[PDB]
Amino acid sequence: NDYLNKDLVSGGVVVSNASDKIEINNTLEERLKLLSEEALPAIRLELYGPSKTRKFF
Amino acid sequence: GNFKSKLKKAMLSQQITKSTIANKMRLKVLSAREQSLDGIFEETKEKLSGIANNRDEYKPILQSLIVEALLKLLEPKAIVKALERDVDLIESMKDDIMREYGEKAQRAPLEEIVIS
Amino acid sequence: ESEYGAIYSVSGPVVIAENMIGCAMYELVKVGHDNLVGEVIRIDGDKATIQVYEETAGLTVGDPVLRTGKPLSVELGPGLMETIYDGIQRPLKAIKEESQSIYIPRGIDTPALDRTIKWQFTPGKFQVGDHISGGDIYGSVFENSLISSHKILLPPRSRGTITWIAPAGEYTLDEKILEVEFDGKKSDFTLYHTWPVRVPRPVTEKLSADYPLLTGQRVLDALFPCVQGGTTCIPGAFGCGKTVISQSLSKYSNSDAIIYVGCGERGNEMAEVLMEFPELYTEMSGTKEPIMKRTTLVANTSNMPVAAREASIYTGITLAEYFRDQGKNVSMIADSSSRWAEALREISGRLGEMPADQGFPAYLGAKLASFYERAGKAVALGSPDRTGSVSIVAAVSPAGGDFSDPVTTATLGITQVF
Amino acid sequence: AINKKAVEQGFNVKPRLNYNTVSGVNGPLVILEKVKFPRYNEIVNLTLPDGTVRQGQVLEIRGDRAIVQVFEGTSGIDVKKTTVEFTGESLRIPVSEDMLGRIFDGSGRPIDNGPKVFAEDYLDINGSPINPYARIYPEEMISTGVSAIDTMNSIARGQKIPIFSASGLPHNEIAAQICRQAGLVRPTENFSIVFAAMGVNLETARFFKQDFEENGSLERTSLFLNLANDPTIERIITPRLALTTAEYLAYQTERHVLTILTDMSSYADALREVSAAREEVPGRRGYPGYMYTDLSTIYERAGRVEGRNGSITQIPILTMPNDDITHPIPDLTGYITEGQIFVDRQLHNKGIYPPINVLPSLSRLMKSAIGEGMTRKDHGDVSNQLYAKYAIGKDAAAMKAVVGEEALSIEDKLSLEFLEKFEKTFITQGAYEDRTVFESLDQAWSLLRIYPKEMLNRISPKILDEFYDRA
Amino acid sequence: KAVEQGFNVKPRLNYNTVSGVNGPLVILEKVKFPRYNEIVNLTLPDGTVRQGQVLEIRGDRAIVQVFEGTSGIDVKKTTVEFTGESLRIPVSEDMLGRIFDGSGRPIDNGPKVFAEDYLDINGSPINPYARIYPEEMISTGVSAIDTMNSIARGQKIPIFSASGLPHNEIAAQICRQAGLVRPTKENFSIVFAAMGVNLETARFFKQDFEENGSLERTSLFLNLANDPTIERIITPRLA
């Protein structure tokens, strides 16, 4: 009955265990927040292309 | 000085050879005694095999061995590994073993005996 | 599945795994999904404590733990000289080509000895139908111009009658070279064999060491000489010259082979050995030949996994012993044994054991004494009769430069040259 | 090329478990219970009741229990309302060539009022040990300008050589001078400087920032600033964020990196604090028994690797408690590092700068970086003779302290003259003076000319013929 | 006689209930009437047999110290058989002139000892009333000992040495030259136990016994530095 804040959440869910002490914030906003950080190198490669000075990985 | 040291070494070599011969003779005596004892035990093993092959004379011994082992275990249920020669002989004496364990342990008779 | 337990606890190098019924003490296991090598050091019901010889970062509770059923062992055969290993007998050069990286990948499994090289095997004095015991030289391969005859020894604790023996020719390590029957069961033997690193290799007889180990240093040769088959320690603070004495002895000593163990020490010290030894030549064989041709390196840098330091030491000595079984005079350089003691101390701390002097485990002195007893001049186990020696030269790094260090106190109690 | 397309799999969302199951807080450490498949070295985010997010590192895992060390401290954390989110990864730093010319917190957060590092990669800050087979032995000599270093403690590019100093000595000035004047003796450009500060007072940070800014090297310097009033435990990751950056610049971008790690003694203090929270068996003078390995994982992140035209030259700065070189921090640092520059309080009091005492100093890579084709052929003999005569002069000064000047031999008086001239001419240099190694080896021979040629017993006869009379 | 009670067979319980192995110690869980200080035989999965001493008992739990080490021991296939006695050594006067392990096993290629008795290695404290006060001086031959630190026959006096010092040579000289100042009317028998010594230390002592003809009078118990460590806790009591 504790519905998500619509101003901050556009979709998705927040799942939790019975005791309500372990949660997973699987919301579209949270997923996008994650993707914005783990996917940053890929985004930079897509936008500005390969770097010129980097020779090894 | 070198000459004196080397003569001392020669004398010590002589003495060590004597001591080593004496030690090998002593060990020869000890090994002969050990081999005599081993022969005695080999004859005892052959005699034990012979007695075990005599079924009528071997049955009381086998019962006593089983009951002694059960009394040491003091378990309600036991397993008995035995020669395939004796499985049939043991099967005919399970009730006797159970009752004898019960009386000799001053405890309720053994619940169950498996024959492995 | 039956051999698979699960990680229960991870703390530094120490992993406690559950459902490990059937594991033996000091048995080798593969921890995690990358198969990190480790050894069981404690059994508690179904839970086994394991010292992992690799980095444990990223190991999760529940990860698989495989029981290999074998102890930690080294592969012994042609292909040991000129090679550098990492402590658990992994070729660092190979690791570099396969990984194609400047690091050492976690849980990388690569053969200790090169299975692609073809060695020119020539049979020995033994022929089909003869009786062969452990340690008997039943062949010889040409490894390099310096080790011109690498002798193929029947593994110790092996016996029987030679059912089949290969002819002279070029064979890879995996190709069968001998077949010996003992009790109707025929055993197949190749150019190499495995030996546990924690059990010293047998000898026929340990002899008194009486020939000098000429290190090339005036002060060491004259005032404090070592013998071939002797045990030496070099305690000193940092910057005293423990690594330069060790490397000078590796370069110029009269030993036929060198096992240099860089135990918990600088990677740069291993880089300079690899760079310099190929450019230094010896006359022991009668012709100028790089000394790298008769040296093996076992490197566990200070920032490599700590628990592997012990392994490296036990690897080195084993390799040394192996070459002593061939009638060679080997010097094994442990630089430094204080780092092995510190690794034991760290594992003991992670285990919550009662500390001995300066935090070290109460069993450190016994371990050092047992390790140093593996040096000596000896008559090889098999035939033909041949005499070898292993000289252990160990650098000691006392904390603060104080020779009251427990490691220094144990070593000086063990060794014969100070 | 398409190598960077391997960055793919970065487009992946991994939902994270939030745990409102903290059980206890013991100083730097927080215990979490009922964790699902805890990961050993994982990094977790603790959201506090007031909304601030701290980071912690899982130090131990046991079944469902996980022990986490929180870098920013555990003050304000409560067992009842603090939440912990498990990221499923180890601590990583975002790396790009744009980190140069930026200033970051001790935990990596930019403090330039600039943007977040637009990551070209995410590198695990613990790194990996370099394969010893993949290393190159450093042999390219860096001319630091200081004659006490370039003639006698010759630093090679890729060397890890700390500065052993004390509380009040001018080690910051010496390090700044080295950063200002370092370069190859035989160049064939500039060093990229990675500066990590652990627990330094505001004055040190201001000094280093001003010195880099004046010198014009800030445009290629990346600063990680943990200050004396910043979280203590954070200092455990500051030298790893810096070195991980250096390893990126040096080995993946082909740069030559000079790494300054100021006050490794504060890093050792933080390590001791964490050890004390852990209830561990303390080592000598209370530091953890594993401090050697922990320091090795920092210092051993330097050198050169095969097939890559970059390098990392470390210069840790290490304050010796009570000026005692046998303290665990300097003692262990000296067993791990390839030499040490010893800043002396006795020379500092005597007005000398740089107060470098050459006798306790060492460069383990000098024997290979100096010589015929690399510096000049007199270098190694001239440094050995200088060391011998300096030690003899110290002995003669001690002897004079007892028996007076009148009783000294002729050789002892020559050694005293050498001592004063060596300390007040060759050792003494301007804070902005740079001397070529050929200028410093011409100053060395003038000191060695105080003695008859037959007293220079450590200089080979061929070198003493060619350079003694030279004039 | 007393030896006649030896003609008795006492079967042994073989347990296979090992529950822990940490260092020297093996914990075994479901013992029936565990006995303190009792000696047990551990059969390993490999099949080799080792010996252990029960260091503590608690209900059905026993803690055993394995003399030869716990390497290779597992909780599944390792069995432990309880002998029911403490550690007894076989003793004959034929032991003189022989060499044994630290555990008392012959290493001179001779046969086992044909026992005249099995004597507990812990002995029994001597009645202080049954003790005689030693007063017969032994000429060690060494002036530093005879004239200023004179040893009486029956005295317990160690040699406090350190490493790199000739304490083996001093002890060998004492054994070589020892004798009464005033002979009563014979050479000492010698019992030499070595714990964690080098191979050359044992060789030195053995060959110096060779050279002086005192080896026929000697029993050696050689636990060298390459032998099990815990076996050193029984070597001095067997000797």
Ligand SMILES: Nc1ncnc2c1ncn2[C@@H]1O[C@H](COP(=O)(O)OP(=O)(O)O)[C@@H](O)[C@H]1O
């Ligand atoms: N025998 C020697 N001859 C010449 N220089 C030496 C010698 N021993 C040491 N050095 C010099 O001192 C440095 C420190 O010696 P090193 O072997 O690293 O000692 P440690 O292992 O005790 O730290 C060497 O790198 C070298 O520059």
Ligand SMILES: [Mg+2]
């Ligand atoms: Mg060293």
